[PDB]
Symmetry: D3
Subunit: 236 residues, 6 copies
């Protein structure tokens, strides 16, 4: 179904793995709901400080004859899992180990930081079926890579390698697969070394001010800044 | 002023070659009429390029009052090219300067020739970009490069245009059209309803917060799921 | 304190405190506010160059309450907004270290040209706080949410080359060639229409915060304003 | 399908009182072309022909629905973003598109006989000409939700109560009042009025700081006009 | 902590009458999961306080105060964004979290004995379940600032004049009225009703053009439904 | 010049009664300086001196920009000040004064008060935030009516459209103001001004972003002694 295992310094680095390698870690509603409950619906426990999310099998991160009314609930489940991943307390590092197409790519775009392997191919092929990307791909892909590249990808519904994904910023870095998880830990243990209060107030400020004008975002930032100043992490 | 060829995809061309396909009021009105305020259901993808293979597109001495009208005509034609039903592929065959560049920035995807040169030199004569440059260039390449290009008013070549994201790809001149064709056809084979509703969703959610954009997307997604292209 | 040198209408502003690596306290912030506020009324100056004194750096009193924390953050927001919304375009010549409030200061300018020795970053979280002078917003609005999140969460420094790769700076030139380079671009902006330049700046800084239609309204208003100016009819010759 | 009378102030009247000036496609196009403006007109009054109706077949494709809702959006936007102000003199029924058309105008002055509403939901659709947004932006979210979910008529007194209309006067004296407000606006500066309209119509969609940028740009533009110094 | 009764329309009632139906986290969870998603048999939801005396009338860990506020946000959003229209029948006291919950609903009909307010600032905190935003979005910034800064209570008449409630009726006949409006919404097309709800709840947060895009999408989406022809 | 008197609540007064407390550049500058606040003051009262008025064509376009910037600066300084502000409209509030009144949080007007935006009768729009603040306070329809007509309105219809919070007899206006200022001053200072920050920021954003602002201010207040005591 889904795996979790935690160790780091303080050992609060939690690797979360999608466990369906027989079907290329494809995401159905069961995987979405289990992801929602693993990310605990907009919070977490206090042991974990950084989350590294990937899919087992070393081949794919994650790669409808239905009831037009039921597709609204389907897209709602997708939106809910993407928001639960996107707004979790700790930072998330998406280790894209191979294919990330459709929902999978959307999942990858819900995370804060993406470290892809030189074997990773991303895309949104929903438009080849007759549907748009229904789990936030029409919005998050734009907000990450620019309207031009997002439009190109969604219109063509094509697949792009991790190198051009790094070129357009869809992934933060590209490393060899053999080193992928290694790098995924190396960044995480770096974020875990910093103050959790500062890191996660920064995350709240960023995730809230991405949707507002500069003045409102600065208000969010100053409020989070005072909040962190009321914390012992600042003085020690 | 106009050129239309539709075979599959409708290539539209600005037919003013002896003036580097310059933008004016008549050309803007012709483009407005050509983009049909939507399109006909036969066309799936549109390619906008310039005649002569020397310039994509490279009367202002008057009356700020009707300068408002000139800017309104520019905004109208840029929004008609931007919000047209079919996707738009801009094949900049050289000079895309000022109103041309802004025009090129109205389309969804820009494919550049190696000889292409883009920029907003309005700041050198008397004015800011008045046909959407100050907003569209920012929304395409980011505020830093937008400010650099607008303040300096300089021209940049195609390679640095793809470096900052103003154009999606750069290909040799002699193979630009072809390449455009291919991409258009790669978009033409996809679902009409899917592509066009995703275009609606993107063009609407670019201006709103993530939640409102997700609402737009779920509405477009249901609308497509009520269409036969989804199941077949 | 702070040094000013103007000629061409090109004004170079220098943070003058090399003993503390041009560190940002409330004094230098207030002096920056006062210098950029005067330049708003200075009609000779056309372009502003912001850089640090010396060849090393462009630019922790926190024993304090949370209310004086709010006041410190407000002073930082004020200096960043005054630099950002100044009349003339600004060129931040990052001649070395730009970390913390210094990097946010550089991010408040219109254009950044960094030396090949420059290192930029937001190490705020390494001492328990987020960026307090607009980093969490301006960094994301300049380089995108992905790289902004990476840099803010790690709190690491990055060389000028990767800063140019992610858009944190516009260009990267050798250190000894930085100053000259900056002035060159400033010259290229100084020769343009001041009316058009500054209405462009107003339109951009206002439309970055709104939908496309409101930004187009701002643009058409600035366009008519410029069309009421003699620069328009006089240079379109 | 439409009448113009410029006497000074242009009164605009939709002309189909046979079934109370309903909003077809053709009157939408006629209103679009009529709202184009010229320098003569300073204020616009838009009312319905028939003395008791301002403006009061569909199982065809969803794509035609999209494009005719786009036509409605276009006519409402053309009415909403004119140079001069618009005074909607609601003489009677304003339901569905009509009321949406009335909500596109700057100011509404209704007769005491006027009943407004959005009954689209009694047919199986939402208001597709801007009601779901303009009604909410005029009367607030609570009253807008109430009116769109009920789809009922309300009397002009309740419209003035919830802000859907600015003022309520007797029908026989509606036009005199609308033209009174018109000539009050036309006596003011054309540049100031029209730049105020641009600033309001653009800043309603933005944060306060952006809107203040809009306002300062329009303010500078008004200071370049001869109407200021005199 | 809360009960449900459906017939034709579903009434949801906070069942804590001796505690004046006050809200803690557990009743919030019960309401969260009682608004599920939903089933297709319910058309209009009426939420009121059990006991016809009050609709609905913190010493650790600011860290856990964040989670308390997140639970409040979750319950308010689940009530607000839910499929069917919601009618808040405030039967008396609606203070603090209770009034915020009432403001999450679509339409509010108050008994003449109702008293609403946000007294959070008398404790040392702002409204933490959406008051600072929803009150301002319902009644406007001036009255919202007044009520939040004073923390005072207001009767049904003043809350109606400021738009905090849509209508005010006698207490002994509140629910009946709350029923009839519900009935009035039940007879309307569920597809049109709920697509209008989605369009409004999404376009209240965006500019006019984005809201019009949402509206035209929902308009075609109601043209997808068979209830348009019948 | 202007004056200030602190008693607990600092009453701030525009001291130009022989000119109906009209606004110039010097008045705006001294108002910016007065609104700076100090930790003792909990509520601010802004009114005009004299019981007659709260506050009632040579420049180029560039100094017109500068004048509009000064007006925006003073209106934003009053609007975003720490403590809640009560504008006691003791008569005329026209033009900038009107806009000044619209910058405060709460407006209590005397029955003889008259509010308006007459800029459009001179050739210009409101340039101190009227075209935005009036629409955000009273709605778009009444703001359009008032700005296009440029007409003065009495206190009661100003209350009807929401331009003022309450209408009080002139002879008692101040006292009523003080009374409200007392009721607000007794509440939590930290909670009330964090509420003010949340409101002034979330008025410009969508619901989700505003709720983020609110939850941040709420957590901030939970770290203050006022919450538990």
């Amino acid at each position: 179904h889904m795996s979790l295992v935690t160790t780091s310094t303080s050992d609060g680095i939690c690797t979360v793995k999608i466990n369906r390698p027989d079907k290329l870690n494809a995401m159905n509603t069961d995987v979405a709901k289990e992801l929602i409950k693993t990310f605990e619906e907009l919070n977490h426990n206090d042991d974990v400080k950084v989350i590294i999310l990937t899919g087992e099998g070393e081949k794919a991160f994650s790669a409808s004859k239905i009831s037009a009314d039921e597709s609204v609930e389907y897209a709602k489940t997708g939106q809910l899992v993407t928001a639960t991943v996107e707004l979790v307390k700790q930072p998330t590092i998406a280790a894209v180990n191979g294919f990330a197409l459709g929902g999978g790519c959307e999942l990858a775009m819900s995370c804060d930081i993406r470290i892809a392997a030189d074997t990773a191919k991303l895309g949104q092929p929903e438009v080849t079926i007759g549907v748009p990307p229904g789990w936030g791909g029409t919005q998050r892909l734009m907000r990450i890579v620019g309207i031009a590249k997002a439009k190109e990808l969604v219109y063509t519904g094509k697949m792009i390698k991790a190198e051009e994904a790094k070129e357009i910023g869809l992934v933060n870095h590209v490393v060899p697969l053999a080193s992928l998880q290694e790098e995924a830990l190396k960044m995480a243990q770096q974020i875990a070394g910093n103050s959790t209060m500062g890191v996660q107030m920064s995350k709240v400020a960023i995730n809230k001010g991405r949707n507002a004008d500069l003045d409102t975002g600065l208000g969010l930032e100053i409020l989070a800044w005072r909040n962190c100043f009321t914390h012992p992490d600042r003085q020690e």
